[PDB]
Amino acid sequence: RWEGGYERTWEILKEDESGSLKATIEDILFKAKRKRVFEHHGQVRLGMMRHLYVVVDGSRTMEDQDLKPNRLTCTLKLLEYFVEEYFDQNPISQIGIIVTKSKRAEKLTELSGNPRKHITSLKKAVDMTCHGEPSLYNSLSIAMQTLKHMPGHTSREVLIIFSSLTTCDPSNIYDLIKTLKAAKIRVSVIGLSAEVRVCTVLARETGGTYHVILDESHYKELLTHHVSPPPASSSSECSLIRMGFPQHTIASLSDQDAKPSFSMAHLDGNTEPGLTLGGYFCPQCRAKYCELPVECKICGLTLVSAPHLARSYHHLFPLDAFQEIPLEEYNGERFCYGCQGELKDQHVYVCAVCQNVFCVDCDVFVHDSLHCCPGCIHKIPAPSG
C-alpha cells in the first residue's frame, strides 16, 4: 500500500529520458523553475521623506522554525539589511523601531536615522524571549501620539512585522480605522506565513499594502517592494521648509588650534555625550557637533546635506525601460554596448530610445546599480534643449 505509495512519489521524479542523457532535463526544469517577478514599477505621485514605524510581533509564533531556527532569525537578520538598504536608498526618512512583547508595545528605538543605533538595537533584539501575545492597539497608540506631533508635511507610514497570530488587543481597533484614516497615517503589515482578515481588512481600509510571507527569498521581495517610497494617498502635503544647509568645519580656519576640543558644554552644538574637535555647523543654532545629515534638537530644523539625500530619490523616479529580443542584429561586432561581450541567451537588451544592445549583466547593473541607461547619455545631452 504505502510502502509502494511512498516510493510511487520517487518512480516518476527519478526517472527521465533514458538511454543516453539521463538526469539532464531534471536540471532544465530547475532552470525553468526560476525567473520570478521582476519589477512591475512605473509609478508617480507620492513617496518622499517617510517616517516609518517598525512594529514587531513578539509572540509564541517565533518558536516555530518554518524558515530558520527562529522566525525572528528569519526576521531580525534581514531587517539590518533592510535598514542599511533603506538608508542606502532613502536617507530623507527615519524609522520608529517599536516592539510588541507581552500584550504591550515598547518603542525600542526612537524615530531616527542613525543606523548603528538601529542595528545594535537589532543586535540587542537577538535574545528576545517574545513572551506573551501581540497587541497592536498599544502599538498604534505609540504610533498615533508620536506621529500626532509630527507635521502634516510628513509621510506617515507604518511597517508591521506580524506573526499572523490572534490580534490580541481590546478597545475597538476597528474604530481605529476612522481614527487613522482621518489622521492620514498609513499602516502596512505583512503576515508571517498566514493571514489575519481583520488586519487584511485593516490594510485594505488603510491603503497600506498587506502581504503574506511565503519564503525567505519571498520575504526579501516585499521588503524590497517596500524599500521604495510608495505613492500613498493624495492630499498629504506639497512642501517642507527651512531645510538647513550646514557647513563642514575644519577647526583650522583662521585661529589654528585655539580650542583643544570643540565640545565643552558651552559651544553651540556639542549635542551628544562625547568629545569632538569641530567638524560640522548648522545655520540656525549655529550648532557644531558630530556630523549628521538629518536634523537637530535646538534649531530643530532639518540638517539637510544635499549630495546625499537630495540626490538619492532625485534619480529614483525618472526611469524608463528596455526591451528584450532573441534576434540577431549583431550590433557591435557581436558585442555589448556596455560590457562588450557575448553569450547569446537570446536576451538582446535594447533601449527604448537610444536603442543600445545590452546583456543581463548590463541590464541588472542598470536596473539594480546604475538605474539609467548611459546610452541615453551621448544621445540626450548632445541635442538637449
Partner 1 sequence: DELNLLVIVVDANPIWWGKQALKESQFTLSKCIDAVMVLGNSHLFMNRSNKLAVIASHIQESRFLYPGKNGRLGDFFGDPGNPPEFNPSGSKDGKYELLTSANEVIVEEIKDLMTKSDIKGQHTETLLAGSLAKALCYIHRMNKEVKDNQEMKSRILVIKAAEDSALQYMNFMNVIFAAQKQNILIDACVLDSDSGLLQQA
Partner 2 sequence: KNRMLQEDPVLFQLYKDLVVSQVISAEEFWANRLNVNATDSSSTSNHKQDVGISAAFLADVRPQTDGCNGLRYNLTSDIIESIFRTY
Partner 3 sequence: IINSFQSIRQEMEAYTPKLTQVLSSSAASSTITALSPGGALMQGGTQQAI
CB closer to Zn ion, 99 vs 304: 304
- Which grid cell is 196? 489575519
Map residue 112 onto helix, strand or coil.
strand
Residue type at 87 in one-letter notation: F
Q: What long-range pairs does 12-20 form, CB within 8 A, spacing at least 24? A: none
Smallest distance from the beta carbon of 165 to partner 2, in angstroms? 11
- Residue 283 neighbours by CB under 8 Å, 6+ apart: 244, 245, 246, 299, 301
> In the structure grid, which three cell numbers stand for residue 117, read together?
543605533
Bridge partners of 158?
187
* Residue 284: CB minimum distance to partner 2, A: 19
Handedness of CA 142, 143, 145, 147 (dihedral sign): positive
**Containing H/E element for 96?**
strand 94-101
Answer yes or no whether residue 260 interacts with partner 3 by CB under 8 A: yes
Q: Does 319 bind partner 1 (CB under 8 A)?
A: no
CA–CA gap between residue 56 and residue 95 (Å, rounded): 13
Number of residues that bind partner 3 (CB under 8 A): 6
Check: CB of residue 162 under 8 Å from CB of residue 59: no
From residue 44 to residue 83, the character string flagging contacts with partner 1 as x (rule: CB under 8 A) and all else as - is ----------------------------------------
Name the nearest CA neighbour of 143 among 191, 84, 99.
99
Which of residues 73 and 271 has its CB atom nearest to Zn ion in the complex?
271
Q: Candidates 166-174, 227-235, 322-330, 371-379 — which segment interacts with partner 2 by CB under 8 A? A: 166-174
Interface residues for partner 2 in 334-353 (CB under 8 A)? Answer: none
d(Cα 217, Cα 197) in Å, to the nearest integer?
A: 24
**Which range binds partner 2 by CB under 8 A, 25-33, 130-138, 234-242, 292-300?**
130-138
**Distance (Å, whole) CA 63 – CA 190:** 19
Site pattern 333..372 for partner 1 (x: CB under 8 A): x----xxxx-----------------x-xx--x---xxxx
Question: Does 384 engage in binding with partner 3 (CB under 8 A)?
Answer: no
Nearest C-alpha neighbor of 287 from the set 274, 273, 303: 303
State in angstroms the smallest separation of the CB of 360 from Zn ion. 7
Beta carbon nearer to partner 2, 56 or 105: 105
β-bridge mates for residue 243, sequence order: 302
Residue 22's binding partner among partner 1, Zn ion, partner 2, none (Cβ under 5 to 8 angstroms by kind) is: none
| Chain residues that interact with partner 1, rule: CB under 8 A | 88, 307-308, 311-312, 314-315, 333, 338-341, 359, 361-362, 365, 369-372, 374-378, 380-384
| Chain residues that interact with partner 2, rule: CB under 8 A | 102-105, 133, 135, 137-138, 141-142, 145-146, 148-149, 166, 168-171
| Chain residues that interact with partner 3, rule: CB under 8 A | 256-257, 260-261, 264, 275
